[PDB]
Amino acid sequence: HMNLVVYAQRGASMPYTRYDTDDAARGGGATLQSAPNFDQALTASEASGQRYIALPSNGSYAQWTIRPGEGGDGVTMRFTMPDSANGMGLNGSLDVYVNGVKAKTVPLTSYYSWQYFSSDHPADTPAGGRPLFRFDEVHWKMDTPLQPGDTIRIQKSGADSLEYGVDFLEIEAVPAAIARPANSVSVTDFGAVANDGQDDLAAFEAAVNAAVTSGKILYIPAGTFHLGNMWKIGSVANKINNITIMGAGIWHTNIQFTNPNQASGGISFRVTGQLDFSHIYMNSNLRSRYGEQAVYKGFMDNFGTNSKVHNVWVEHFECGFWVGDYAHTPAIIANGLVIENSRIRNNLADGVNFAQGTSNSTVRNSSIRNNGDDGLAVWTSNVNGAPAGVNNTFSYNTIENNWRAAGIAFFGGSGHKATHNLIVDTVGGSAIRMNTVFPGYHFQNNTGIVFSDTTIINSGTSRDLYNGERGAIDLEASNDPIKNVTFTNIDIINTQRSAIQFGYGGGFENIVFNNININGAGKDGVLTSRFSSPHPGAAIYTYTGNGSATFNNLTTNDIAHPNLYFIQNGFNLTIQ
Ligand SMILES: [Ca+2]
Ligand SMILES: [Ca+2]
Ligand SMILES: [Ca+2]
Ligand SMILES: [Ca+2]
Ligand SMILES: [Ca+2]
Ligand SMILES: [Ca+2]
Ligand SMILES: [Zn+2]
Ligand SMILES: [Zn+2]
């Protein structure tokens, strides 16, 4: 089946509209906090547009008026609140008023968020370095839909001493719960109970077996279900052929993993045919990456052939998705997986990684927000003899508030493309990056990779986790060359340092940039440089003399660097 959405020209098409910082009236002690120079010491460096509303004291509020033609009963809020001294987080709340009537007290926590950097590896307590992941999200449903002209106010109460921050609200109409399909099995048929705080994983496991035995859809009805360990769907020894698992909607069905330990939450698929998983919100009890040993991604392992995971909402996992087989020799692969119409946010590392030879697979029309490593990545690893991943696609996505690495990244293989994306407000990194720094296949047999039709805003950096600059588009020939890449119809707006950056010595071959518009660079004002002599941010920057790149129809405006380009001697740059 096709999960139909009329796509936007660039970015994802979602049912919410945004009520952002400058749309709000502030009062009662609320203040505007901003980081216009992108200084990562400031919490506001991680707010959208580097601006948010601080609610420091009882009575401080941010208030929005619903616009004509907008509204709804589903509200998402991007917020910040302090961590605890021991890094376990604090619990708190904010109050919601509609037209002056108190509607909700929304519980809040900093448990999931806050990661600390004194190296390129995060630490879990404030003693471990400088903070990132300072913002997080919650969502809730109103008893009645907000209507044009309504005012919705977020207000700090007398409950505690904590200073909260509110970045934005996103507001949407919530459809009713999706009906139980005919001749399906439900987790409640096997003892699961919604909303009782009791563990449902035994019932979920039994329901999977019954669905597979009967060939029936597995339905998860509306409500919150609690799973006290990893949900393993099939086993390596007894893999599942085909399975369909459907909830009642991202606003109705919540899967809450309750176990904070390593390898103790998320979903592990052991599927060889087609899985279809949809219409579910999932949350973790995870606050640490466990040094890449968390084994606690939202969706993991064997995704089969022409599978779909669509219309899901997942947050606070190690990664949103990690697609890749580590259990077979030679490795098996997912082929033709489609991830679409989904919200993959606030994870401690990658939003989605297509690894271990994952091929012909796609992430599209999705919101990829506030993740702690590459938003969407293809890592063509080769553990256990996995083949090179080829022909993966990241298109029509809105990728916002990345706080490590890049919004989109390719690390090897052939034929990947990323088109029609909107990439906004990266921190410590790039909208787009490629490198050859990781194990596995690189680009020697790449027939061509394409980036196109993409808008990049407020991205690039002067301070990644190595205290160095990165381009809004960053290409690094770390060991092997970057080869056969085309960028077409890219708008790069208000870049922090340099818009396009090339470096390391592995080589740059057949790199073409067509119809590029660069409007604003060097906006962070930083002049110190990891790689080179001091310089304002440029339109094009290289810190290697080994490479070539060709630009056709380049336009520039508002470039901090007076020379427009800052090219190391030896690099062959053509601009025509
Ligand atoms: Ca659907
Ligand atoms: Ca903002
Ligand atoms: Ca934390
Ligand atoms: Ca239960
Ligand atoms: Ca990563
Ligand atoms: Ca032109
Ligand atoms: Zn489906
Ligand atoms: Zn490590």
Numbering used by the authors: 0 to 575
Text from the published report:
α-1,3-Glucanase (E.C.3.2.1.59) hydrolyses the α-1,3-glucoside linkages in α-1,3-glucan, which is found in fungal cell walls and extracellular polysaccharides produced by oral Streptococci1,2. α-1,3-Glucanases are classified into family 71 and 87 of glycoside hydrolases (GHs) based on their amino acid sequences. GH 87-type α-1,3-glucanase was isolated from the culture filtrate of Bacillus circulans KA-304 and termed Agl-KA. Agl-KA hydrolyses the α-1,3-glucan of oral Streptococci as well as of fungi. Agl-KA is also multimodular, comprising an N-terminal discoidin domain (DS1), followed by a carbohydrate-binding module 6 (CB6), threonine and proline repeats (TP), a second discoidin domain (DS2), an uncharacterised conserved domain (UCD) and a C-terminal catalytic unit (AglΔDCD-UCD).
